[PDB]
From a paper:
Insulin binds and activates a receptor tyrosine kinase, the insulin receptor (IR), at the cell surface. The activated IR triggers signaling cascades to control many facets of physiology. A previously reported selective IR agonist without sequence homology to insulin, S597, activates IR and mimics insulin’s action on glycemic control. To elucidate the mechanism of IR activation by S597, we determine cryo-EM structures of the mouse IR/S597 complex.
To reveal the molecular mechanism that underlies S597-induced IR activation, we determined the cryo-EM structure of full-length IR in complex using the complete S597 sequence comprising both components-1 and −2 as well as the linker connecting these two components. The cryo-EM map of the IR/S597 complex was determined at 5.4 Å resolution, indicating the structural flexibility of this complex. In contrast to the IR/S597-component-2 complex, the structure of IR/S597 assumes an extended T-shaped symmetric conformation, bringing together the two membrane-proximal stalks. This structural feature suggests that IR bound with the full-length S597 represents the active ligand-receptor complex. Each S597, which adopts a helix-loop-helix fold, is embraced between two IR protomers at the top part of the extended T. The S597-component-1 contacts the L1 domain of one IR protomer, while the component-2 from the same S597 interacts with the FnIII-1 domain of the adjacent protomer. In this way, one S597 molecule simultaneously engages the two IR protomers, thereby stabilizing the active conformation of IR. The linker connecting the site-1 and site-2 components of IR that consist of six residues was not resolved in the cryo-EM map, reflecting its structural flexibility. Our structural comparisons reveal that the conformation of one protomer in this extended T-shaped IR closely resembles that of the protomer in the Λ-shaped apo-IR dimer. This structural analysis strongly suggests that, after the apo-state of IR is disrupted by the binding of S597-component-1 to the L1 domain of IR, the two protomers undergo a rigid-body rotation using the L2-FnIII-1 interface as a hinge, leading to the extended T-shaped IR. Indeed, we did not observe the α-CT motif in our structure of the IR/S597 complex, which suggests that once the α-CT is released from the L1 domain, it becomes disordered.
Numbering used by the authors:
A (entry chain B), B (entry chain A): 5 to 150, 168 to 173, 179 to 265, 277 to 296, 299 to 458, 465 to 515, 531 to 539, 549 to 658, ...
C (entry chain D), D (entry chain C): 1 to 31
Write the structure that this text describes.
Amino acid sequence: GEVCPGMDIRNNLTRLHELENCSVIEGHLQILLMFKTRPEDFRDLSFPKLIMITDYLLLFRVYGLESLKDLFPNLTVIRGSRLFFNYALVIFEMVHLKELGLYNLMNITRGSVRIEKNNELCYLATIDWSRILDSVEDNYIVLNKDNCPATVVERCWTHSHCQKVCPTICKSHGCTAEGLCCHKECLGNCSEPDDPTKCVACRNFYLDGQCVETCPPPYYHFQDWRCVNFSFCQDLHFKYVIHNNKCIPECPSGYTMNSLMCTPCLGPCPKVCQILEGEKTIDSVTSAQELRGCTVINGSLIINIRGGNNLAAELEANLGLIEEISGFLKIRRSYALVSLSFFRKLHLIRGETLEIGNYSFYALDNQNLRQLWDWSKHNLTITQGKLFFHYNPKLCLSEIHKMEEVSGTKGRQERNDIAQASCENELLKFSFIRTSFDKILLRWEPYWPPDFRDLLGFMLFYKEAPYQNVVVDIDPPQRSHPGWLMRGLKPWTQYAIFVKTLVTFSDERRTYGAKSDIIYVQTDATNPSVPLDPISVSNSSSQIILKWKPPSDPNGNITHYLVYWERQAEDSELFELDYCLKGLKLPSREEHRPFEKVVNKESLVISGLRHFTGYRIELQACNQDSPDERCSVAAYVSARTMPEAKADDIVGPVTHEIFENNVVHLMWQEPKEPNGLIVLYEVSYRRYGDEELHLCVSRKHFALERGCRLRGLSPGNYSVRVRATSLAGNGSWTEPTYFYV
Amino acid sequence: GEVCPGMDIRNNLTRLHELENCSVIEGHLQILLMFKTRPEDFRDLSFPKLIMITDYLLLFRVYGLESLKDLFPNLTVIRGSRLFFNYALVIFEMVHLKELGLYNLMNITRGSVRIEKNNELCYLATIDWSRILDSVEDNYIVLNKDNCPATVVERCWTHSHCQKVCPTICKSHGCTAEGLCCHKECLGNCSEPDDPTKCVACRNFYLDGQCVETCPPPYYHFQDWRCVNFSFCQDLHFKYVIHNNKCIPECPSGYTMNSLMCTPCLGPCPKVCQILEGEKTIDSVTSAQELRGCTVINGSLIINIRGGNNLAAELEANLGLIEEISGFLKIRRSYALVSLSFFRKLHLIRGETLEIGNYSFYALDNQNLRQLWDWSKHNLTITQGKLFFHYNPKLCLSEIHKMEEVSGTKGRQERNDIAQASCENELLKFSFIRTSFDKILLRWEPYWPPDFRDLLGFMLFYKEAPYQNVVVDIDPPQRSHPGWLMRGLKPWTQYAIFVKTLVTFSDERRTYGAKSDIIYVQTDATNPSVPLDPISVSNSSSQIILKWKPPSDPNGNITHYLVYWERQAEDSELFELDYCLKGLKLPSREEHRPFEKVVNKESLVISGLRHFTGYRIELQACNQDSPDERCSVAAYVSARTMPEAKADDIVGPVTHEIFENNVVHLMWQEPKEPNGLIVLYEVSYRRYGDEELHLCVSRKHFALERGCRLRGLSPGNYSVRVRATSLAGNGSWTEPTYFYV
Amino acid sequence: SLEEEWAQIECEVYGRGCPSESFYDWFERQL
Amino acid sequence: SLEEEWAQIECEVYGRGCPSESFYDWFERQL
């Protein structure tokens, strides 16, 4: 059959007759707005040749129609390549339709079904769309009048046609009247089962009367449903491109037209933007937004923005991507515009279209246009046309001569082509520069115009310039070298400074004055900022890891970090307090000092530290090493080493002395190297046949009694065990001393 | 004698001969730079008539002179009204002088003496300046060759003249050869003692050949040394004023010339500032600084500032104080100038001097001058001359017509006198305004020029205007009422809003567009800020005074302060902890709640509170009363009442029970209403012939034993006293319970 | 509130678009 | 430092005046 594009048939049924020879519609078919059609107009109107619709089918306001079983008897597959609001089948407001009648449709590859507001429409609840569409949750079929196989009730569409159901083994390939599955590449149905050439539709692609899963080279996929040779795509190109074996109408993003395959071309994609009759005036942000991404322009550009606000950033973002101009360039009546520097990629002007009077560049009524381009690094090329310069006081003959030399149009301009203003032709130099950590002194040679009265002072412009890719009034000097001093500069910062003189535009030839060159001056360094966030962790018994963040203000190139540490002595009150009573809630935690220089590092490790010993780590940053290091103030952090697990164990033989009156004197050797200090000693003694009894020996008690002295002890065999209580926790009980009294 | 002004004699000695008839110099006398004079020129050169010098005497580079005993024999008083660097006598670099010789000087009323670098000068250490000057600490007499009364060494000046010393009783009035004191009004000396008419000089003032302490009316003091009539001062005025009976050359600050006494005239003092040949051009801040305080100008003003920076504040501060202009006014080539509004007091232009061509007001080359004056409240008067308006695009015919109508020069201007620009002649209105606490919606009727393409959008200007004494781009509407919304407005703030349309200046008659009127819109109020700094003090036992500061953000008119209070319960652990052991360090410190509304007040008083009871005072501010008060979040402060001084005293009869085995059971009644709670009870018991013994009863002990139970008590007579220890401190001991066992 | 009204007027006079021309809207586009 | 030098040059070329014409200066004013 013949392949045809999509139609939008309305008003009259004559345009429908073009479907008589179409078997596949490469597009969408819409049928709408017939208020005169009657059922007598549709009795023998049929299009059995049509089978598959690529995009979608739409029916709207169709009067006189009652069923599609005659109009579209053999319509089988709706690919749904392009969807009408995610619908491949739209049946809206059918006043006279009584049934769908489409007894050959079996699969809708993409899209949903919307059947709404169709009065008199029946045989809808008997349609099983689940076997047609992979997902039917999006189907919107509401507000209607609503032998054959039965699915979860019988499925039917007409009084004579049942709903065909193929076996699950056949999948979506279809089945014949006998139920045998079609070919794996068959879609819809098959005149002969298991035959790719006999498929009424192709599941993946159609080529040479056959159904294939892909288009072999050199054939490329077309409309995601067929395969076409390169010749057809090329013919379509001349009133289409090739990319990934697809004859897509246009290349994707990031690709350029390589004379017929798309080729990557980085960001800037060479494209020919065709202007309406080759003429367009830019006056607003939205006007320039239409030129987004353009690189080659097939027309002339006229620039006239009647604004008043600095919109240079937006213009540079939108424009500046064009490299060649076919036509002429005109600039006129630009008030807010100050320069043409935002024309980033503007290099060549072909000038095929010229302004009247043989002009390629036109300039008029420029009230603020002082500079054209950075001719030191920007190059401009002009092919044809003459330059125009008139009524532009802000632009003087120096810039005009520079641009004429750059373009190469020296012997191309005649008379009258070229006719408060910063046009300092003369040059100034700086005589003496002195720098401080925050103060800068500048000195330049004095300048005197022929009429010294025209001089009205100087303008100094300063700004912080980290990169070299680039408002103070100074009184006129009295009638040697004028100078200035500034103090508001951050240390270790680069500032761009240029001085502009102030001259009076007299009635005669005004002395244009002298401009000083831009210079970059770096402020002197000083003491850096404090390194905050100091964390010191005892990752081991005697190992301390210290981490910190670099200071907020480097104030120069940081050379190193100066670290000090000092043993932190515990409170003396702990050596005199008694804890044997109730309330045993134990709180658990110039001179030269050992110093470290952390160089090219952000962490430090400290070893050889006593267990459970506090330390006051002091941190400073220094941006200087040999000459009297400039270091910030001290940053203090407390670090405590983890105590030993054995320092709390009592060692030494426990000695006991028995008096005549059953008085026991207990001598024990304390762990002379404890976990900081021992608050008290815990003793648990128990006679045979009795219960354990607890006792506490304080530091004062241990010092005065050299241990313990129990009095009034009953006869029997005792057991003596002593536990040393330190800050790290309870220690280990002594060996059981057994004595009989 | 005759009175003469000051002289500055130099080069030649001829000009000295004018001193022959001068007895009093009303000024200073300087004698300098004679390189030809010789001692033979001064042998009989004398001026005995001269007596007193008002300001000072100066001698410099006087060659040939050796002594002043002949030149100035009778010079007696140096008043020092005007001092040469605080010196009334300067004797600098006398090469040939050998002695001062001024044997008649006796008092220097004001100033010091400087005698430096005078070689060959002797008889200096013998001069006593203390009797001459009140203070001689400022005398600078360095680097020189250096019968008679003796003062702390004899005082002399020449080989024949002694230093006259008057008795202390004579003070500075002088004394004759007999030592008798002169008259009380005499100064210097007196031919006849005690005679005001015979004084060689007047201490206070001189009048009619007599010395007086003040000038009686109508005579006024002149030069602080004499008295003159009003006729003399008036004659001096016509090539002087009267103020406080003083013929001062000029009136003091804050006074005006009342046609001949100075009269107060508030700040603006009417003064005639005479311009050099009646012409002056203002182009700089220092140029305008010369016109500070001027009110009436006798000349013409030309204004042309070739600057580029907004210096309107400085110009308004300096200028704007002038009310009348005798000459013409010209404005030309003003770039940075935007308006003439800073001419605060400029009302009348006399126009006596006119620009060539019969022009009083000239205007030319005004590149930014958009407005002249606020003609709604500012009035301008032009007497003569014609207006000029040319090459001023920023000023249009509307302002010109307004100023012509205001001045009253309608029928005074001929042809050619009057010839990107904000000149919106048409008016706009706002259609709908909606306000929120931080958001404002504006709506105005659409505007369409005859050429809608010329419209390029709208400009909205907003600023916070607390007083009515007074930058957003809006896209053009599509081809009903355009509107805008803003959200960055503080609550309860007034903002001034006016919308300006954007139109294109076409080649033909440009449509000037329409401007919208300024409006003031106040943002809606909201919940105010938190009232910080809450201080609550128990000024009494049950009185709490609460003070706070108003919230930082009122967010409306604050209606009242909402205050809540709640009893703060103490920690329960204090009711279970035992404190009888060592370590007696005592730490000393929906629902409806009682609320208060502080209205028109910043402090609150709370009564009826239990002693030593904590309270959590909650404070909020509300700018609303009836309709669902908008109150800020709670601010919490802790207040503790001062405890009672008697609640810690134990009351009730102390009971004791004696057992058979000398066991004592003590029952006491605790102060059921204590200062918060009682931590423990302190008991001190002492038998006769023994020492006091201490005991503690804890809360647990008191609860379990219902008091105390002492065991093992020796026979004798005991004394029982119990003290209750509360948070407020130690209580009062119980009555001494005496029992014999 | 003010946000919804501002959005409504923005779509009414500036045509940024609170409504997107939908399945329904295309039909009265044809009428 | 830089402040004293800046003041010196200010009085040297702009004549704001670090020195005030003194007792001495008036004499060489006459010479």
